[PDB]
Design a protein around this ligand. Structure first.
Ligand SMILES: O=C(N[C@@H](Cc1ccccc1)[C@H](O)CN(CCCc1ccccc1)S(=O)(=O)c1ccc2ncsc2c1)c1cccc(O)c1
Lengths: 99, 99
């Protein structure tokens, strides 16, 4: 699809058995999801945004479907106010910016 | 142009007559530039991101040329970690997400 930017580019994602709304975020290197109790091993990480850093749990090779397109990769889980789909998955679903 | 996302979508902008590098950021509602001087009146504002809130200076109706495309709009200036072109100006230059 084509998504204009008059409003936040929120889409439905499917991850770890849940449907969520997530922001397609070209400014995010990584994918950062709101707190969710995913199974499996993880590694601690700190990621920085406007306002400072938050602590997240890094889960690898997690399947995630974004607006009907399958992806698989690293997802960071922590106290973000918004689910953020970053470039690591945007590239996998063939997403580009166009103007 | 069409911009893919395997690298950060950084572009050159021209603002107050100066060249800068900025990130095309669909996750950003507003445009936020690193500390700099701009002409004219500004008002204090606060904005929030992944790591909390920051204080910025709101400049209205500021011309910026983004990768060769003209915009004139609100520019926030403050301790953002990176220069960010947000949706308020991405819409002005006709930027969409496509996959
Ligand atoms: O930060 C904003 N928006 C962010 C997403 C958001 C939206 C709503 C609520 C919370 C967050 C960004 O789109 C993603 N972040 C990095 C991008 C900027 C930037 C880039 C680099 C450093 C600092 C800021 S970010 O969320 O901080 C982010 C995302 C993924 C990621 N992976 C590794 S570091 C990292 C940082 C934002 C911008 C303007 C106004 C505003 O009110 C909020």
């Amino acid at each position: 699809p084509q998504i204009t930017l008059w409003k936040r580019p929120l889409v439905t994602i499917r991850i770890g058995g849940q449907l969520k709304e997530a922001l397609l975020d070209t400014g995010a290197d990584d994918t950062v999801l709101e707190e969710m109790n995913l199974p499996g091993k993880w590694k601690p990480k700190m990621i920085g945004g406007i306002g400072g850093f938050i602590k997240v749990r890094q889960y690898d090779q997690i399947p995630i479907e974004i607006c009907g397109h399958k992806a698989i990769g690293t997802v960071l889980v922590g106290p973000t106010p918004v689910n953020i789909i970053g470039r690591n998955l945007l590239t996998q679903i063939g997403c580009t910016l166009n103007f």
